[PDB]
């Protein structure tokens, strides 16, 4: 049942078996019923660890390829490509789940569109040429859409709106290499949360001030 699937995801998380945790939450998602805030986090955590393990491996092999024969060089390129499509297949898996089942409450719509912009950003980290330019536009469109919805329907101190602006500013800096726009987005999100700092909800206030510190850390780093 739906209950036993979420328990298996909780079990796989504690066992640090995130492939099973992602497969469990994929089955929960494919039940077409909306997911709670807890099930949203279990799905996001599972697939972030799956794609994160491929990102960390890709960065190691790619940096070795830049340093490294014509026989040891092609093997590194063949290994970087093998990890690449593993990463891209994971991103293809989540984006299909988001577009077919999860993206259609305003808090859930920005959480899922932020995921869409995140995993399209992870594709841009490994893509080149027109392939990179295509996934960059798809990441920009998902971020910008969740950006406008979070303004109209959410508080400036909400952790989901704050986390979205953190990754959106990182998108302009790490992907588009636009530090002026990256700083302006992070500073605006920080200023808006400060002006409405009285709206800090008693439960999720330690999560809001955490992201507000992260926005300042990136702002100090980018200036």
């Amino acid at each position: 049942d739906r209950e036993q699937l979420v328990q298996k995801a909780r079990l796989a998380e504690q066992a640090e078996r995130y492939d099973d945790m992602a497969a469990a939450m994929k089955n929960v998602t494919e039940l077409n019923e909306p997911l709670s805030n807890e099930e949203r986090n279990l799905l996001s955590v599972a697939y972030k660890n799956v794609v994160g393990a491929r990102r960390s491996s890709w960065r190691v092999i790619s940096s070795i390829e830049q340093k490294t024969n014509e026989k040891k060089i092609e093997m590194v390129r063949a290994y970087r490509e093998k990890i690449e499509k593993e990463l891209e297949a994971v991103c293809q898996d989540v984006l299909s789940l988001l577009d077919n089942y999860l993206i259609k409450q305003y808090e859930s719509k920005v959480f899922y569109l932020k995921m869409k912009g995140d995993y399209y950003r992870y594709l841009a980290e490994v893509a080149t040429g027109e392939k990179r330019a295509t996934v960059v536009e798809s990441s920009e469109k998902a971020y910008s859409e969740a950006h406008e919805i979070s303004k109209e329907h959410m508080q400036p101190t909400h952790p989901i709106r704050l986390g979205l602006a953190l990754n959106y500013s990182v998108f302009y800096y790490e992907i588009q290499n636009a530090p002026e726009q990256a700083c302006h987005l992070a500073k605006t999100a920080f200023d808006d949360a400060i002006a409405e700092l009285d709206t800090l909800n008693e439960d999720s206030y330690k999560d809001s001030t955490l992201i507000m510190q992260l926005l300042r850390d990136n702002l100090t780093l980018w200036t």
């Binding site: 986090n41 953190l166 990754n167 990182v170 790490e174 992201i211």
Partner: peptide, 8 residues
Amino acid sequence: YDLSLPFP
């Protein structure tokens, strides 16, 4: 990398 949100 490592500049993004470390959690959902």
